[PDB]
Amino acid sequence: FLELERSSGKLEWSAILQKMASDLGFSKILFGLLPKDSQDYENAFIVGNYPAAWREHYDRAGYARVDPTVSHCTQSVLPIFWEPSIYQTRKQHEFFEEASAAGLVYGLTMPLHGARGELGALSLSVEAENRAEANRFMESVLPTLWMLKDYALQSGAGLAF
């Protein structure tokens, strides 16, 4: 975990974080960070291997105002699973439909709240065959993921700022 601290740059650090989450069973990973009182999601510090087509479309669609994981991160420190039950509006249902077309079907989102008021997320998708296999998997690794998201926040807030 503390390799994340050691890393020189965003580049090597980004490569460690992706090895680490891949090692755990995840396929697509997003680390995002904003400084305190900023809603400029379209311009956050972003690391990982999320499909760039999804990220650009998400930007243009204004999906930061729709993504249920985003309003959740601004109010909570606790994980949110990409369960069908977090997609509660016609817009969020449609947001899920497009995220699926990009392979972001099963996963979770750990909110990040740093010591300097930084706000962000560690999102990780898993490539599973049904909600039951996805959820059992994510609960196994949840306690390692719970430590990892804060090491990422601390070393990651360090490189960005």
Ligand X SMILES: O=C(COc1cccc(Br)c1)N[C@@H]1CC2CC2[C@@H]1O
- Residues 6 or more apart whose Cβ sits within 8 Å of residue 68: 80, 86, 87, 88, 92
CB of 101 to a copy of itself, least distance (A): 30
Q: Which two tokens stand for residue 134?
A: 């996805």
What residues from 53 to 92 belong to the interface with ligand X (CB under 6 A)?
67, 69-70, 73, 82
CB of 46 to ligand X, least distance (A): 7
> Closer to a copy of itself at the Cβ: 91 or 113?
113
Give CA–CA dist 104/106, Å, rounded.
6
DSSP H helical ranges for the chain: 3-6, 10-23, 52-60, 68-75, 90-101, 131-160
Question: What is the layout of strands, in order, in the sheet containing 45-48?
Answer: 45-48, 26-34, 119-126, 106-113, 80-81
Q: Does 120 bind ligand X (CB under 6 A)?
A: yes
User: Do residues 127 and 82 lie in contact, with contact meaning Cβ atoms separated by under 8 Å?
Assistant: no
Q: Does 116 bind a copy of itself (CB under 8 A)?
A: yes
> Closer to ligand X at the Cβ: 74 or 144?
74
Q: Does 48 bind ligand X (CB under 6 A)?
A: no
Interface positions with a copy of itself (CB under 8 A): 36, 73-78, 111, 113-117, 119, 142-144, 146-147, 150-151, 153-154
Interface positions with ligand X (CB under 6 A): 30, 32-34, 41, 44, 67, 69-70, 73, 82, 99, 104, 109, 119-121, 123
